Ligand binder design. Structure first.
Ligand SMILES: *[C@@H]1O[C@H](CO)[C@@H](O[C@@H]2O[C@H](CO)[C@@H](O[C@@H]3O[C@H](CO[C@H]4O[C@H](CO[C@H]5O[C@H](CO)[C@@H](O)[C@H](O)[C@@H]5O)[C@@H](O)[C@H](O[C@H]5O[C@H](CO)[C@@H](O)[C@H](O)[C@@H]5O)[C@@H]4O)[C@@H](O)[C@H](O[C@H]4O[C@H](CO)[C@@H](O)[C@H](O)[C@@H]4O)[C@@H]3O)[C@H](O)[C@H]2NC(C)=O)[C@H](O)[C@H]1NC(C)=O
Ligand SMILES: *[C@@H]1O[C@H](CO)[C@@H](O)[C@H](O)[C@H]1NC(C)=O
Ligand SMILES: *[C@@H]1O[C@H](CO)[C@@H](O)[C@H](O)[C@H]1NC(C)=O
Ligand SMILES: *[C@H]1O[C@H](CO)[C@@H](O)[C@H](O)[C@H]1NC(C)=O
Ligand SMILES: O=C(O)[C@@H]1CCCCN1
Ligand SMILES: [Cl-]
Lengths: 166, 573
């Protein structure tokens, strides 16, 4: 292939792509995605990184809103962000750790924007719906047993009474 | 005495053929394209032949076999055959009741089984087949029947449907043993509860989004598919199966009536009430069906819009259903290199195709009404109420059919002098339940399809044809008219004579000829089969062994007449 693309970089593997759908989850009464919303999103991501590094690796790292670098913003509200070291740009947190951090505190990020796991897609982090706990044994089997028992008792008593009468 | 007889006939006629069979028969054959022949086949075939049955029941004042033997010995076989058909009906009809029982027992759960699809296995999404189809369709085809992909593939006897069928037959036997004349308050109750439940479901069914689409599909008589002879055949056979013509129990019911009674009013009233009940139930069912089709169309449009938006980086709400083609053209005009990749992937969906292929088959009523229940507020109560109305209808119809089966057996002194009637009825129920286990297999729904379409479908036409020729030409229509006039004071109207003598037999013969010609020209009988991978219904040719059963079911009952004639001729010589 002759030529080059101005979008590939050796550190582009560590980027995480976010896609946001404001007008589908909220319909009306939906805020616009201006720079303040991006600031809040970067603050939320930095908070998630702090929580992960505090509750797992037991390291106190002072992330900030400037350590979540964002590119390729588009009217769909779909961009690519990566989290670097607190005061050292050359160091990029590997994508696995960022994904674990997002998984740990995805509910808080969802609540900060009033989105629910479908209008805030991280394109690589998929949520878990939750196991559908089962009733004790089976309601239908119990009901069928009761009905069959009463029907059999009725049949037996009717046959016995008819035989005894004649 | 008029109320007793009229309500007995109504309770016999109004059953699962009105609420269950009519909706899916209408859906299968084009909706309006099926409704126009139905009415056309009701004025010509329903009323005159029902009136003829009731008059033969009165003027003979004997049973079916007794009447058709007293008219002429060479004809007594048509009394025997009219029993055999009932047998086959009672062989499979109960399966429907079993299904309702199943759907009742899975109605006391907060997470209704047909409401939410099971988890895929990652615990992050839904099942592939449960997503391609609906939750109701997945429950009906997999959780209820566990239908095999083809008729050639069958497993063992599914124990849950077998137990449900056993319970239904036990209930029928208990109803047989318990009551025979205590239907006093029942006729006051069992005739209004189905109408009340259908009224409730109509009140819900006419406020759903896109209900008018369903009504428009129901009432539009598409001329293109109106030329199908199978539609006319199915309309006539459904009329006969819903009125009970050919089963021979209407003759027995009219045998107990006074000869100074108006059977012209009663026949007209019964036929009109049956037609109105069928139309009302089908209206509710098709309103819910139209809601389903509209929902599927909207879902497909939303999926296509989401597919385009996630790729072209369009705004969240920019791409709507009102500006889809234009934006598609705009996107295509913007750059074709990107559009070329996914052009196969973009799917075309329209209301018409969804309406033809949303839901179809013998489970149309169950799927549609479970969907409607899942869209209620207290789903459990409405599900219980509907599947209890359905249970009452099925139980009443089966009581009528089994009485028609059993009366000749009880009247036979050879059997009545050896075993009690309680044992004869027990043996009949046991034989029927044991034979009906073939409908509980993995491929049992296909055998149910065969019996629902051939066991009591065309034999009822030939039986009624033989009966009307017997009444008109062998007995003598002038003698019959004189006897009826002496019995009731009023001579039969000229219209009834015209429909008895020439019009109805000629129409039946023409229908038979058209059906035979169509079958010969096509040369390939096909059935619908579930496809879970595609999640829809596909057409497959019947195997070699399924045609033998299809032929025998009709052949035994129909050929029981000429064999009896040959036997009588041999006995004479
Ligand atoms: C901001 O963040 C950035 C991150 O982006 C951070 O920059 C990093 O800083 C660290 C610390 O200084 C650097 O680590 C140093 O790397 C020096 C480079 O020389 C080595 O380079 C190769 C590294 O590969 C390592 O890992 C592989 C895989 O595990 C392993 O196989 C290697 O052996 C090595 O451990 C390495 O290949 C290379 O090889 C030499 O030797 C081989 C024979 O083994 C020979 O064949 C080669 O030809 C070559 O000669 C070489 O080893 C390295 O010199 C340096 O090591 C010295 O110090 C350490 C102690 O710190 C001693 O243990 C060691 O013996 C040496 O004395 C150290 O490893 C890292 O490279 C930077 N990364 C980048 C991208 O810049 C900044 O520091 C941050 N800034 C702030 C302010 O925080
Ligand atoms: C979810 O399950 C499917 C199999 O149906 C599998 O292909 C896919 O990789 C699974 N997803 C994840 C995140 O593991
Ligand atoms: C949809 O319509 C287009 C144009 O009529 C056609 O080329 C295509 O085959 C159809 N089906 C799909 C799945 O795209
Ligand atoms: C899905 O599963 C994950 C663990 O695999 C769990 O943390 C998460 O809470 C689940 N989602 C629910 C229960 O809604
Ligand atoms: O409408 C029904 O379901 C019944 C079936 C048996 C004959 C009478 N009609
Ligand atoms: Cl009908």
């Amino acid at each position: 292939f002759v030529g080059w693309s101005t979008d590939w970089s050796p550190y582009a593997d560590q980027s995480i792509k976010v896609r946001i759908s404001l007008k589908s989850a909220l319909g009306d009464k939906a805020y616009e995605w201006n720079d303040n919303e991006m600031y809040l999103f970067r603050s939320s991501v930095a908070y998630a990184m702090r929580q992960y590094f505090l509750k797992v690796k037991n390291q106190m790292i002072l992330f900030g809103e400037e350590d979540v670098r964002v590119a390729n913003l588009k009217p769909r509200i779909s961009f690519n962000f990566f989290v670097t070291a607190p005061k050292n740009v050359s160091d990029i947190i590997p994508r696995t750790e960022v994904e674990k951090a997002i998984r740990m505190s995805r509910s808080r990020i969802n609540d900060a924007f009033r989105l629910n796991d479908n209008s805030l897609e991280f394109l690589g982090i998929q949520p878990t719906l939750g196991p559908p706990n089962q009733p004790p044994v089976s309601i239908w089997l119990i009901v069928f047993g009761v009905v069959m028992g009463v029907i059999v008792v009725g049949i037996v008593i009717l046959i016995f009474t008819g035989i005894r009468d004649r | 005495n008029s109320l007793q007889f009229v309500f007995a006939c109504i309770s016999y006629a109004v059953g699962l053929g009105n609420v269950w069979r009519f909706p899916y028969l209408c859906q299968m054959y084009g909706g309006g394209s099926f409704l126009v022949p139905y009415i056309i086949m009701l004025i010509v075939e329903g009323m005159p032949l029902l009136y003829l049955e009731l008059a033969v029941g009165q003027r003979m004042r004997q049973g079916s076999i007794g009447a058709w033997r007293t008219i002429s010995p060479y004809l007594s076989g048509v009394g025997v055959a009219s029993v055999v058909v009932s047998f086959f009906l009672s062989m499979y009809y109960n399966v429907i009741n079993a299904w309702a029982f199943w759907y009742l027992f899975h109605s006391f759960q907060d997470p209704l089984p047909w409401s939410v699809c099971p988890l895929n296995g990652n615990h992050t999404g839904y099942d592939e087949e449960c997503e391609k189809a609906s939750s109701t369709q997945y429950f009906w085809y997999r959780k209820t029947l566990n239908i095999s992909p083809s008729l050639q593939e069958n497993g063992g006897v599914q124990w849950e449907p077998a137990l449900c069928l056993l319970l239904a037959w036990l209930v029928v036997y208990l109803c047989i043993l318990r009551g025979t004349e205590s239907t006093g308050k029942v006729v006051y109750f069992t005739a209004s509860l189905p109408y009340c439940v259908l009224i409730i479901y109509l009140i819900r069914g006419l406020t759903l989004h896109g209900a008018t689409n369903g009504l428009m599909y129901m009432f539009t008589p598409k001329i293109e598919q109106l030329a199908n002879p199978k539609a006319w055949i199915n309309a006539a056979t459904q009329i006969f199966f819903s009125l009970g013509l050919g089963f021979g129990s209407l003759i027995a019911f009219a045998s107990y009536n006074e000869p100074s009674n108006n059977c012209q009013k009663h026949a007209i009233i019964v036929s009109l009430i049956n037609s109105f009940t069928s139309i009302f139930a089908s209206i509710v069912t098709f309103s819910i069906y139209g809601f389903k089709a509209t929902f599927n169309y909207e879902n497909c449009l939303k999926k296509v819009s989401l597919l385009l938006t996630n790729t072209f980086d369009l705004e969240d709400g920019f791409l709507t259903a009102s500006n889809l083609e234009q934006v598609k053209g705009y996107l295509a005009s913007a750059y074709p290199s990107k559009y070329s990749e996914m052009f196969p992937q973009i799917k075309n969906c329209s209301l018409e195709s969804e309406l033809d292929t949303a839901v179809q088959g013998t489970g149309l009523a169950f799927i549609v009404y479970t969907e409607a229940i899942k869209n209620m507020e207290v789903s459990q109560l409405w599900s219980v109420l509907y599947f209890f109305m359905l249970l009452m209808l099925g139980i009443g119809s089966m009581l009528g059919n089994t009485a028609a089966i059993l009366t000749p057996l009880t009247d036979s002194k050879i059997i009545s002098s050896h075993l009690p009637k309680e044992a004869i009825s027990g043996l009949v129920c046991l034989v029927n339940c044991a034979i009906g286990m073939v409908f509980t297999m993995e491929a049992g729904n296909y055998w149910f399809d065969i019996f629902n379409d051939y066991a009591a479908t065309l034999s009822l036409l030939l039986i009624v044809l033989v009966e009307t020729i017997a009444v008109c030409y062998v007995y003598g229509l002038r003698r019959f008219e004189s006897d009826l006039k002496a019995m009731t004071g009023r001579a039969v109207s000229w219209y009834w004579k015209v429909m008895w003598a020439g019009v109805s037999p000629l129409l039946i013969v023409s229908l038979f000829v058209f059906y035979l010609s169509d079958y010969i020209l096509t040369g390939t009988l096909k059935y619908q089969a579930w496809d879970a991978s595609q999640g829809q219904l596909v057409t497959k040719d019947y195997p070699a062994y399924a045609l033998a059963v299809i032929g025998l079911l009709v052949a035994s009952s129909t050929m029981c007449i000429p064999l009896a004639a040959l036997g009588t001729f041999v006995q004479r010589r």
